[PDB]
Amino acid sequence: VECDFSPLLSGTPPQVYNFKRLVFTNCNYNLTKLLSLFSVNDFTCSQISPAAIASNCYSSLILDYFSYPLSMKSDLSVSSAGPISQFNYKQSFSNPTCLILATVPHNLTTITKPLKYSYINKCSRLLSDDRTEVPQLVNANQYSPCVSTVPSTVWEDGDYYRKQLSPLEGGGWLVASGSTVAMTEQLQMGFGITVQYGTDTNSVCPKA
Amino acid sequence: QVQLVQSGAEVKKPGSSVKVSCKASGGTFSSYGITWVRQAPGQGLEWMGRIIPILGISRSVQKFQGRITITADKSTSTAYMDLSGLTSDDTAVYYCAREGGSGYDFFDYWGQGTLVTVSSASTKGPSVFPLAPSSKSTSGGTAALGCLVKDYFPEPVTVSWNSGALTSGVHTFPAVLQSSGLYSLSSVVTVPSSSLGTQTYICNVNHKPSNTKVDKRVEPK
Amino acid sequence: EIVLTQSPGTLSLSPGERATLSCRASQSVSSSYLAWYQQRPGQAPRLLIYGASSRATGIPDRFSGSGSGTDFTLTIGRLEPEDSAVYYCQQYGSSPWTFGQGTKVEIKRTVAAPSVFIFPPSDEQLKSGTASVVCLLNNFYPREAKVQWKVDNALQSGNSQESVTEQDSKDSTYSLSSTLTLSKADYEKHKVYACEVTHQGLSSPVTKSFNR
Numbered sequence: 001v002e003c004d005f006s007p008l009l010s011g012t013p014p015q016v017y018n019f020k021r022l023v024f025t026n027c028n029y030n031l032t033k034l035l036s037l038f039s040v041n042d043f044t045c046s047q048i049s050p051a052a053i054a055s056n057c058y059s060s061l062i063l064d065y066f067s068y069p070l071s072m073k074s075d076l077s078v079s080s081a082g083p084i085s086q087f088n089y090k091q092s093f094s095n096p097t098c099l100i101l102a103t104v105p106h107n108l109t110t111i112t113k114p115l116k117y118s119y120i121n122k123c124s125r126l127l128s129d130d131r132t133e134v135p136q137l138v139n140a141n142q143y144s145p146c147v148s149t150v151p152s153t154v155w156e157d158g159d160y161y162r163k164q165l166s167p168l169e170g171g172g173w174l175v176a177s178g179s180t181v182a183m184t185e186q187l188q189m190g191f192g193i194t195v196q197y198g199t200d201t202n203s204v205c206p207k208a
Numbered sequence: 209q210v211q212l213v214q215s216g217a218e219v220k221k222p223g224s225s226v227k228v229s230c231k232a233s234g235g236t237f238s239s240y241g242i243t244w245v246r247q248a249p250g251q252g253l254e255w256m257g258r259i260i261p262i263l264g265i266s267r268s269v270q271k272f273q274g275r276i277t278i279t280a281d282k283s284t285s286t287a288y289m290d291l292s293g294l295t296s297d298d299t300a301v302y303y304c305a306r307e308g309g310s311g312y313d314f315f316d317y318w319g320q321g322t323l324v325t326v327s328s329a330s331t332k333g334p335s336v337f338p339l340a341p342s343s344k345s346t347s348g349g350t351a352a353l354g355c356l357v358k359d360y361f362p363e364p365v366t367v368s369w370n371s372g373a374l375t376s377g378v379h380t381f382p383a384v385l386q387s388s389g390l391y392s393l394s395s396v397v398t399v400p401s402s403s404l405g406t407q408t409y410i411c412n413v414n415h416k417p418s419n420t421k422v423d424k425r426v427e428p429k
Numbered sequence: 430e431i432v433l434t435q436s437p438g439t440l441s442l443s444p445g446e447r448a449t450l451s452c453r454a455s456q457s458v459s460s461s462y463l464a465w466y467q468q469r470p471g472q473a474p475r476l477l478i479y480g481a482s483s484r485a486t487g488i489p490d491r492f493s494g495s496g497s498g499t500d501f502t503l504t505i506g507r508l509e510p511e512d513s514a515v516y517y518c519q520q521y522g523s524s525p526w527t528f529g530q531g532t533k534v535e536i537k538r539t540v541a542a543p544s545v546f547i548f549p550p551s552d553e554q555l556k557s558g559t560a561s562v563v564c565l566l567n568n569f570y571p572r573e574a575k576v577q578w579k580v581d582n583a584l585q586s587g588n589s590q591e592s593v594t595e596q597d598s599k600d601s602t603y604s605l606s607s608t609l610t611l612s613k614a615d616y617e618k619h620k621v622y623a624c625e626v627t628h629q630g631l632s633s634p635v636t637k638s639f640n641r
Contacts, residue, residue, distance in 0.1 A: 162239040204292035253528040314464040318473035338551030381592040
């Protein structure tokens with residue numbers, strides 16, 4: 001009954017706005033048995049200490065993984081007001097939360113490389129009335145409702161994807177835009193753990 | 209179906225700045241980019257850049273990067289380029305056109321177009337020239353008369369007859385370079401209204417740089 | 430960046446004849462990511478075909494669109510004289526979006542025995558500058574018309590300058606304006622001025638007469 005980080009080590013990991021999820025509600029986890037397989041670069045945690053996320057029992061451990069270069073590690077936190085934390089991926093401020101920004105090594109295999117890291121720059125809705133515009137702000141993980149328009153990876157430096165909602169609801173072009181960043185020699189990934197405790201129960205526990 | 213109305217032939221000097229203004233008649237910039245498209249005189253279209261006022265995003269071709277700023281004022285809904293730092297080789301007619309998005313960026317509706325003419329030579333006024341209809345011509349069908357426009361430097365000069373009424377036999381010839389940088393073009397019209405060959409006393413001409421308008425009356429001599 | 434070939438270019442075809450325009454791409458493009466445009470004599474280009482298959486909303490379906498991967502063909506099943514225009518194939522497939530060299534369609538209907546008129550100088554720029562005479566050649570087909578100025582029954586040098594307008598959308602005819610600007614004073618004993626026209630139209634050189 002060990003936690004299954006196995007699916008994390010294959011394929012092309014998805015871009016930031018399309019982050020996949022792994023929810024573990026009953027298993028035993030040895031995280032350093034994972035982080036040993038990467039070259040950890042930035043371990044920043046809020047509402048629980050970075051060392052404390054290694055050994056304590058929770059109710060559900062949620063892990064999100066994606067490709068995110070170190071060039072813009074500044075955008076990814078509750079501090080930023082840019083597009084990474086506002087139209088792409090927002091993690092709940094209510095419950096504890098760790099955020100790792102790691103790197104793939106050469107000696108690791110079957111972590112294939114997406115061509116480039118892209119993210120949703122802007123996500124607005126242009127009302128069915130005259131010209132009124134309302135930005136779309138992503139709530140707790142929400143997949144960024146502009147995600148249907150934007151493909152898995154954005155093609156060029158700045159693109160423009162728009163769709164027309166069927167009339168009522170709501171006649172408003174769920175317009176979105178995407179922007180990319182240059183490839184780095186080693187795949188640089190970002191992981192987000194969102195642990196939450198229980199009423200009087202604890203499953204996920206440091207496999208020691 | 210939004211008609212696109214642009215600005216008018218800026219004459220600038222090699223080393224200047226031109227704000228071409230494309231207006232979105234309707235009041236409505238919807239989810240619709242403006243893409244700008246060059247066309248050197250007697251040549252084939254290029255791409256120059258794109259914007260979306262809905263998001264403020266702008267993109268430019270690599271060659272024209274560091275010299276061009278394409279902006280738009282979503283509230284008053286009017287888009288502009290500003291080709292600063294331009295040479296003499298950019299003397300071309302510039303169009304503004306409506307995007308469609310990501311996989312549908314074909315240019316649907318286009319603007320009338322705004323010829324930028326960039327060389328430090330001069331601006332000269334459309335000196336309109338005698339008409340003088342030929343006497344013994346056709347037996348009524350076509351009494352040809354035309355008010356000529358010679359000696360002006362920067363194009364355009366649109367010459368309509370009857371201030372835009374007589375639109376049925378207004379033959380206009382493209383301007384051809386003379387000995388000086390100035391060029392000249394000729395306007396002619398056909399009247400069946402033989403004796404007195406009269407109502408054509410407009411011969412209105414508009415010069416976009418000089419802003420000089422000349423109207424003359426035709427007399428059968 | 431994709432440099433692209435077009436059709437032969439100027440095409441002479443009678444009305445009711447099918448016309449084929451080619452658009453080979455030096456670099457591979459998507460099977461359906463190219464748009465054929467048409468610009469009339471003196472105007473802004475209007476969309477004819479988008480995606481190399483679909484037609485623009487309100488475009489008569491003579492203008493068929495086909496071709497895939499490398500070669501894209503625009504075929505105009507029937508031709509009217511209101512088709513005389515310049516056609517560009519733009520590959521919005523790559524980046525930046527490269528317009529085609531462009532092909533010119535010329536609808537081959539009539540030979541139009543021309544109408545020659547003189548508009549000799551009058552006392553408004555014979556009271557300033559350099560006067561200029563002119564020779565109008567209204568309604569003529571095709572563009573193969575040559576005019577030489579005759580001054581006092583003596584032939585003239587290359588001091589002319591002939592300007593010919595594009596074919597009319599309905600008329601499909603080519604009108605001309607050969608001009609002979611002269612030194613403002615030099616109108617003494619040169620009693621007559623004329624333009625000599627050689628055309629497919631009209632058996633003879635149709636010369637003219639000023640006197641006045």
